Amino acid sequence: TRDQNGTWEMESNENFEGYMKALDIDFATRKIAVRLTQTLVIDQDGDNFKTKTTSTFRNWDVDFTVGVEFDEYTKSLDNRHVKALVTWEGDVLVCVQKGEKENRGWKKWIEGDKLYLELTCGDQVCRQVFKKK
């Protein structure tokens, strides 16, 4: 389904280390980032999304309109400039972050009662599963 509204609680986190290493996040930060407990909160109204990802490590927020390119300066992560665009491929929400890293972005989808998020950078994929709270 395309409705990703909800408050979403992480139940698994695979290869988050590999993903952050592929973004060149420094080692000491990676040890402390990485939380198996993480809340994703999504407000979706037509093409407008407001998302907030929360954890005892960091709180972060990003708002976007599907189909409207937006510049990002990822000062909270690897400190790069990317051009981001979020679009639907069927019921999979696809973000590509164009810039230095290849294959950078993410895909997000609802399957059954759960939210699946696949974060990509270079050759690395991080898979996260959330249950609806």
Side-chain angles (χ1 to χ4, degrees), residues 1-2 4 86-95 106-110 116:
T1 171
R2 282 191 186 156
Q4 311 195 160
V86 182
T87 59
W88 287 103
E89 298 181 354
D91 300 327
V92 178
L93 191 65
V94 173
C95 173
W106 46 250
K107 291 193 181 170
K108 182 183 308 152
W109 71 102
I110 305 287
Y116 297 82

Side-chain angles (χ1 to χ4, degrees), residues 1 10 35-36 41 43 49 75 85 96 126:
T1 171
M10 176 180 266
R35 293 311 165 93
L36 268 324
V41 179
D43 175 342
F49 277 86
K75 314 289 280 162
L85 172 69
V96 299
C126 162

Side-chain angles (χ1 to χ4, degrees), residues 3-56:
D3 182 11
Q4 311 195 160
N5 272 108
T7 289
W8 298 99
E9 300 193 321
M10 176 180 266
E11 62 184 24
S12 58
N13 195 356
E14 182 189 355
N15 193 40
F16 194 52
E17 167 59 3
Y19 172 78
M20 290 187 101
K21 285 192 61 144
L23 284 171
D24 311 311
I25 287 143
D26 70 282
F27 181 86
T29 298
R30 301 199 308 266
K31 167 145 171 132
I32 260 38
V34 156
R35 293 311 165 93
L36 268 324
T37 286
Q38 267 208 34
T39 304
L40 173 65
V41 179
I42 293 170
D43 175 342
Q44 165 184 352
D45 179 24
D47 56 11
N48 306 130
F49 277 86
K50 296 175 136 175
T51 71
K52 304 206 199 118
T53 294
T54 72
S55 87
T56 58

